[PDB]
């Protein structure tokens, strides 16, 4: 089924509508005339759809008509500009890098009084190490502006300066990136002296991981403990408490983790170490067969998804009742997940007929993937237009559909069919599992690709033997989306294996992550 640009302009803005516009663009079916008013028809004007629309109607990067005159000057003529213009252009470190030293000296004097931030950056670029100058001034705004201009600057930072960095918005991304990418060793070492009192949440957690990479177990514990107290989400507290336990072995930390309301690999593992029973899994078995809702209409999903996410408790009860059927099971569970404020464990097995002939281990891996990929929503579409329950990228759906399986009249929209999503999932998982073995490694490869995963596993510091392995390697997976994905799919895998009467101890999975 196709949609002309004119039928799509009549639908609500949504990722479904973006997907179908992008499909017209990649087939060259959007004329220059069709492309005129088309910005106002796009839900998320980012990535492929934007670079594709800009091949037709290039945009000039809007500069505020207020400062338009300020962008007629260059480094050769900036001294002929009024003071407002001078200060605007000096927002760019590249512009500053481009000026000659004499003009940097001049502008530094102009701005010493009302803008010492600018004076500091101008005089810093008159030296061969701008970072060393900014660090000596303990200018925090300047530090992050330089870091963002170039990652290559690296210097030791003293205790007074590191303890100021966390008060700035940039700190979280800065800490996450240098620790996970293993860049800026002098920055990394310096961050050992951050007082756990001056950090919280993700920044506290990554500083714990940092402290472990230097075998500073006392500092790591203090950071993870501050992470555990401050984190909003129970899943992240559990991750932090797991590290407090693994470092200092207080049996109270392990008890608190085994009693967690969050079902995740850390609480599952703690329950197994304390002989605590498996957590309660909800049984969803609606008597009603189907309803008037089309589970194959991607537009219908985007509309009802928006409704559900914006529903008061009362509206959730009306929706719970409409969607309490076997054909709309995945939407029922989505509504109940919200209606019970994410307190109950829902692990549905919808369109089960399509997978009952696979062995129970494979069933559990497929179900684990689909639950995290889509929550079993057949017309699920990602911001990168991954499609259906198993979230295939088009290139991959088409490679399997046309080139490998030669399905007649194949279209990538077939990924919206449960029969197809499950079938393609099985096929793709066979390819990944034959090369990778561990379901955690398959999870990384499924989300981030097998190239990425082979490159990570080849490193001699990832998933090798060590004190805190394999748990530390799972915190050092370089692509964040893939690091979170693996943990979540692993937990899902453990649960589905349990529901299918094919239980495995998560301790066996952790042992098989270490390469012997
Ligand atoms: C915190 C969390 O796990 N959030 C879930 C989302 O991640 C999930 O979206 C899916 O995430 C995958 C990576 O984990 C992507 O590969 C996948 O394309 C993406 N799917 C969609 C539809 O964007 C959503 C799915 O409903 O649920 C969140 O709870
Ligand atoms: C289910 C799905 O569509 N997964 C996508 C990944 O497959 C994809 O990774 C790439 O997959 C190719 C097909 O097997 C590999 O040949 C390729 O090497 C791999 N890329 C890398 C960097 O390893 C990723 C990103 O392209 O997106 C997923 O959604």
């Amino acid at each position: 089924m196709q949609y002309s640009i004119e039928k799509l302009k009549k639908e609500e803005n949504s990722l479904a509508k973006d997907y179908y516009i992008y499909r017209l663009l990649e087939k060259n079916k959007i004329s220059k005339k069709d492309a005129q008013d088309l910005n106002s028809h796009i839900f998320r004007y980012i990535g492929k759809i934007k670079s594709e629309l800009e091949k037709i109607i290039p945009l000039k990067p809007y500069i505020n008509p207020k400062y338009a005159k300020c962008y007629t000057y260059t480094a050769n003529t900036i001294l002929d500009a009024n003071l407002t213009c001078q200060s605007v252009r000096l927002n760019s470190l590249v512009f500053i890098a481009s000026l000659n030293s004499k003009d940097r000296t001049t502008l530094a004097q102009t701005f010493k009084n009302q803008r010492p931030d600018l004076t500091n950056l101008l005089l810093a670029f008159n030296t061969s190490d701008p970072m060393s100058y900014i660090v000596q001034k303990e200018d925090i705004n300047g530090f992050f502006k330089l870091y963002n201009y170039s990652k290559k600057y690296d210097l030791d930072l003293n205790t007074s300066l590191v303890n100021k960095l966390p008060n700035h918005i940039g700190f979280k991304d800065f800490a996450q990136n240098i620790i996970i990418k293993k860049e800026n060793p002098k920055f990394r070492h310096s961050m050992l002296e951050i007082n756990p009192e001056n950090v919280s949440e993700d920044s506290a957690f990554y500083l714990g991981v940092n402290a472990l990479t230097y075998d500073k177990t006392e500092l790591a514990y203090d950071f993870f403990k501050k992470a555990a107290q401050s984190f909003k989400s129970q899943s992240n507290k559990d991750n932090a408490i797991f590290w407090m336990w693994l470092i200092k072995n207080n049996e109270e930390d392990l008890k608190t983790l085994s009693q967690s309301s969050s079902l995740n690999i850390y609480s599952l593992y703690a329950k197994e170490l304390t002989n605590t029973p498996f957590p309660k899994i909800e049984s969803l078995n609606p008597s009603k067969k189907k309803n008037n809702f089309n589970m194959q209409d991607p537009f219908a999903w985007q509309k009802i998804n928006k409704q559900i996410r914006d529903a008061n408790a009362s509206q959730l009860d009306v929706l719970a009742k409409e969607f309490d059927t076997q054909e709309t099971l995945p939407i029922y569970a989505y509504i109940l997940e919200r209606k019970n404020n994410f307190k109950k464990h829902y692990f549905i097995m919808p369109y089960y007929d399509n997978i009952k002939d696979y062995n129970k281990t494979r069933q559990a891996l497929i179900l684990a993937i689909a639950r995290q990929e889509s929550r079993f929503i057949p017309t699920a579409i990602s911001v990168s237009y991954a499609l259906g329950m198993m979230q295939f990228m088009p290139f991959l759906a088409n490679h399997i559909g046309e080139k490998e399986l030669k399905i007649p009249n194949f279209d990538q929209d077939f990924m919206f069919k449960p029969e197809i999503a499950y079938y393609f999932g099985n096929y793709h998982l066979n390819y990944l599992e034959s090369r990778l073995k561990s379901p955690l490694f398959v999870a990384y490869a499924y989300n981030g690709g097998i190239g990425f995963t082979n490159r990570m596993l080849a490193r001699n510091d990832m998933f090798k033997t060590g004190k805190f392995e394999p748990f530390l390697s799972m915190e050092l997976v370089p692509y964040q989306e893939s690091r979170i994905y693996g943990k979540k799919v692993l937990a899902n895998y453990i649960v589905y294996r349990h529901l299918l009467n094919d239980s495995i101890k998560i301790s066996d999975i952790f042992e098989n992550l270490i390469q012997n």
Side-chain angles (χ1 to χ4, degrees), residues 144 165-166 168-179 200-204 206 480:
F144 285 103
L165 296 184
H168 186 296
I169 46 170
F171 178 72
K172 200 202 110 181
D173 278 6
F174 165 86
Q176 174 182 155
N177 281 307
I178 72 177
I179 298 168
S200 60
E201 304 186 39
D202 303 75
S203 291
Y206 291 129
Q480 175 176 30

Side-chain angles (χ1 to χ4, degrees), residues 204-347:
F205 189 90
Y206 291 129
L207 287 175
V209 171
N210 192 50
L212 292 179
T213 66
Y214 294 99
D215 201 32
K216 298 287 168 182
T217 57
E218 278 310 306
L219 297 194
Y221 171 85
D222 288 343
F223 279 133
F224 285 120
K225 175 182 223 150
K226 184 50 182 299
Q229 292 158 2
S230 42
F231 259 142
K232 308 301 178 191
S233 106
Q234 183 66 52
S235 200
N236 292 326
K237 298 179 173 295
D238 291 351
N239 199 149
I241 293 161
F242 176 70
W243 279 107
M244 289 166 67
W245 180 67
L246 202 58
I247 301 162
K248 270 209 160 296
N249 312 107
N250 179 359
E251 266 154 62
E252 276 310 319
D253 294 332
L254 189 69
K255 274 203 67 224
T256 308
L257 184 56
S258 61
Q259 291 167 355
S260 169
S261 71
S262 191
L263 196 175
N264 56 74
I265 55 168
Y266 305 105
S267 68
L268 280 175
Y269 187 38
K271 278 178 156 72
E272 181 179 299
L273 290 168
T274 54
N275 187 47
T276 309
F278 214 75
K280 186 189 203 281
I281 317 305
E282 299 314 314
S283 175
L284 293 194
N285 200 10
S287 26
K288 203 180 164 214
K289 211 95 274 142
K290 52 136 238 220
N291 66 6
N292 294 311
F293 192 79
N294 190 357
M295 294 289 293
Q296 294 304 120
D297 187 1
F299 295 110
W301 169 241
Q302 299 295 319
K303 201 197 188 122
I304 204 81
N305 190 24
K306 205 197 285 155
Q307 253 163 78
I308 293 165
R309 285 185 167 292
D310 215 7
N312 63 53
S314 171
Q315 294 158 313
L316 288 171
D317 303 336
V318 181
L319 287 171
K321 284 180 212 207
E322 187 51 40
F323 288 94
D324 191 6
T325 86
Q326 219 124 67
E327 209 221 316
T328 69
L329 184 48
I331 299 181
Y332 189 51
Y334 192 100
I335 292 159
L336 290 188
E337 205 109 53
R338 268 129 208 99
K339 198 197 107 93
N340 293 116
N341 319 281
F342 300 91
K343 267 161 212 190
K344 286 174 161 225
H345 309 314
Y346 297 108
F347 287 80

